[PDB]
Amino acid sequence: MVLSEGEWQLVLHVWAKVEADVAGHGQDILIRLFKSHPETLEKFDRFKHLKTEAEMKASEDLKKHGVTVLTALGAILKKKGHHEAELKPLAQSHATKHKIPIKYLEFISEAIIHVLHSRHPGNFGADAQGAMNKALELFRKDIAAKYKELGYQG
């Protein structure tokens, strides 16, 4: 797929808003993922003892991991689809070490969109939502192609 120059502009405009509070966004996104799809929590040995939202919000290490996730995702989005070199280390760890199906990437894409609405109620319209969905779909499609390049069925 291909985004218009105007769609990338929208994605990068919304991402500047994330970059102003990376830790807050990343913490909310992982908690939403875990509450919506508790099976994903079992993939995190360090976090699977957390059982309630209130324990999750008090974990400093969960927040740190949020920053890690969004920092990587931001570097990719800023490439406006010219991201092959950034995807390779990511596909490698997620396919071969963590053993994350592409389905779980759809789940965290849903959590990102939900948290962007929850944190930016008047700043994230249908046009920006559509552009971000396209950019995240482009990401998931290209990382599924990198899983296959590595010999895995995501």
Asked if 63 interacts with ligand HEM (CB under 6 A), we say no
Give min distance, CB of 4 to ligand HEM, in A: 23
Type of residue numbered 116: L
Q: Is 65 marked as a binding-site residue? A: yes
Q: Which run of H or of E encompasses 136? A: helix 126-149
Task: Check binding of 29 to ligand HEM (CB under 6 A).
Answer: no
What are the angstrom distances between the C-alpha of 129 and each of 8, 34, 80, 119, 137? 12, 22, 16, 13, 12
Contact between 119 and 66 (Cβ < 8 Å): no
Of 2-10, 14-22, 79-87, 88-96, the segment contacting ligand HEM by CB under 6 A is: 88-96
**Which sign, positive or negative, has the C-alpha torsion 132, 136, 141, 142?**
positive
Residue from 48, 49, 57, 98 in contact with ligand HEM (CB under 6 A): 98
- The reply on whether position 104 binds ligand HEM by CB under 6 A is yes
If one asks whether residue 96 binds ligand HEM (CB under 6 A), the answer comes out as no
| Choice from 9, 68, 96, 123 touching ligand HEM (CB under 6 A) | 68
**DSSP annotation of 135:** H
Residue 124: CB partners within 8 Å, gap ≥ 6? 14, 116, 117
> Is 114 known as a binding-site position?
no
The verdict on 40 binding ligand HEM (CB under 6 A) reads yes
Q: Cβ 94 to ligand HEM, closest distance in Å?
A: 6
**Dihedral (CA of 50, 56, 60, 64) sign:** positive
Which residues, other chains included, contact 45 with Cβ-Cβ below 8 Å and sequence gap of 6+? none
Instruction: Assess 27 for contact with ligand HEM (CB under 6 A).
Output: no
Specify binding-site residues for heme b: 94
Residues making contact with ligand HEM (CB under 6 A): 40, 43-44, 46, 68-69, 72-73, 90, 93-94, 98, 100, 104-105, 108
